[PDB]
Amino acid sequence: MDAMLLASLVADDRACRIADLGAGAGAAGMAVAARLEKAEVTLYERSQEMAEFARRSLELPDNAAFSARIEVLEADVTLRAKARVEAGLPDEHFHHVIMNPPYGLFEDWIRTASAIMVSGGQLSLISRPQSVAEIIAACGSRFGGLEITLIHPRPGEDAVRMLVTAIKGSRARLTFRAPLIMHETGSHAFTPFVDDLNNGRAAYARNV
Amino acid sequence: MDAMLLASLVADDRACRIADLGAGAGAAGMAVAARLEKAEVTLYERSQEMAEFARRSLELPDNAAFSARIEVLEADVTLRAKARVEAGLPDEHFHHVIMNPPYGLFEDWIRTASAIMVSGGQLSLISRPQSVAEIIAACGSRFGGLEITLIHPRPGEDAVRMLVTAIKGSRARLTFRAPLIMHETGSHAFTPFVDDLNNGRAAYARNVRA
Structure with a gap:
């Protein structure tokens, strides 16, 4: 469910460029492209192995409707500056950056997300609730207007x-x-x- | 409303000692004492005027049933070490410390809350949601098992x-x-x-260790 919920945060019906920083083989970025016919999606993977796996996943007839709008790039998303640009993570380029890092990486990944984002672009992420301090610190002097939406299984539960x-x-x-x-x-x-949200039938938009 | 919600966090049926580090005139500590007959409450105020004001409030006849169990002390709750003790904030004494600081502060107040708390005692607080990072940082290496409960005015609203x-x-x-x-x-x-919670008819308890 993580990848679908993450993808649903891209509430944008304009032609836009979206980066999916991982982790996964691109399930979230693929869900975004499946829903938003004008989205251009870039899936970043660190390793050749993971990149090739994501690529073979995208060669399935099952994904043919949207696959042309997706590209898989091999890049270490923790790189900085010149190394970052040289790795194919361009400055001030993406309208959206989405991420679900593995269970920290938030400082590195949000630093990259800020660098590769156009002015006023949107960061979207899903995590465990216990990451909240790490996430807020990582956004400092980079992203503001944070909107945090907790997800509970059912009434009364954590x-x-x-x-x-x-x-x-x-x-x-x-x-x-x-x-x-x-x-x-x-x-x-x-x-x-x-x-x-889980079935790609709706987006979950920010307040404004 | 802040004071009633804050007070409801003390879910304890023992004789217990509670410190209200108090941004207010003791409304939260009074609400705890009103509900918990066995609680012994200490209200801390920085200024003489505020302490005076709180003491006058305690004398109102609607507070007479529990006021004997509420002591108001003048103390700067940001004091450290021996200065803190001298000011009437004893080491490792309280079962509960409650706070609603006014809008460095969380760090200072939670440092004091830890110093004056018995081992395993409970910190309770109410704040704006925007304070979440400052609160978690101030708890660092002092308090754990944080339970955070957001308060929304009605369904769908922030x-x-x-x-x-x-x-x-x-x-x-x-x-x-x-x-x-x-x-x-x-x-x-x-x-x-x-x-x-508002009527003092219930506490809002932490999750059971289970």
Whole structure:
């Protein structure tokens, strides 16, 4: 569900360039492209092995509808400056950068996300709730207007995931959005809104 | 409302000692004492005027049932070491420390909360949600097992307040609890759980160690 929920944060019906910094073989960036016909998506992978795996995944007839709009690049997303540009992570280029790092990397990855982002572009990420301090510190002097949306399995239960979006250069203080509850009490199905997100039928937009 | 929500975090039926580090005139500490007959509350105020004011409030006849259990002390809660003790903030004495600091502060107040707390005692606080990073940093190496409960005014709307509880010396990672929603859409009435908290009819307890 992580990749679908992450992808749903790109609430943008304009032609845009999106970078998916990992981790995965591109499932989130692929979900974005499947939904947004005008999205241009770049999947970054550190290793040749992972890049080749993502590439073979994109050669499946199953993905033919959107695969032309996706490119897989081998790049270490923790690189800096000249090394970063030379690795194919260009300055001030992307309208969106999305990430789900493995379970820290937030400082390195958000530093890169800021550098490769156009002015006012949107950072989107999903994590565990316990990463919140690391994430806020990593956004310092880079991204503001953070919107944090906790994800709870059902009423009364602790949060299991956390969505965060932010805007490069924004001065706005952070806000916690109303939480997303995955199920009603006593119900096996997902709640209507979460179900639409999970199936690519809807985006989850920022307040403004 | 901040004071009632804050006070509701003390879920303890023992004789216990509670410090209110107090941004206010002791409303939170008073609400704790009103609900918990066995609690012994110390209200700390930096200024003589505020201490005076709090003492006058305690004399109001509506507070007479529990006021005997509330002591108001003048003390700068940012004091350190021996100065802190001399000011009447004793080492490792309180079972609970509660706070609602006014809008370095969290660091100073939580440093003091840790110093005056018995081993395993509970920190309780209410704040704006925007303070979350400062609060987590101030807890560092002093308090753990943070439970963070966001407070939303009604369904779909952003959080307006945040409750945090933590245990001295715990090395458990933080938890976000299910949030409290103050009101149903279209009503000025409180939601039933929150209404109980408001009436002093209930505590809001931490997750069981289970």
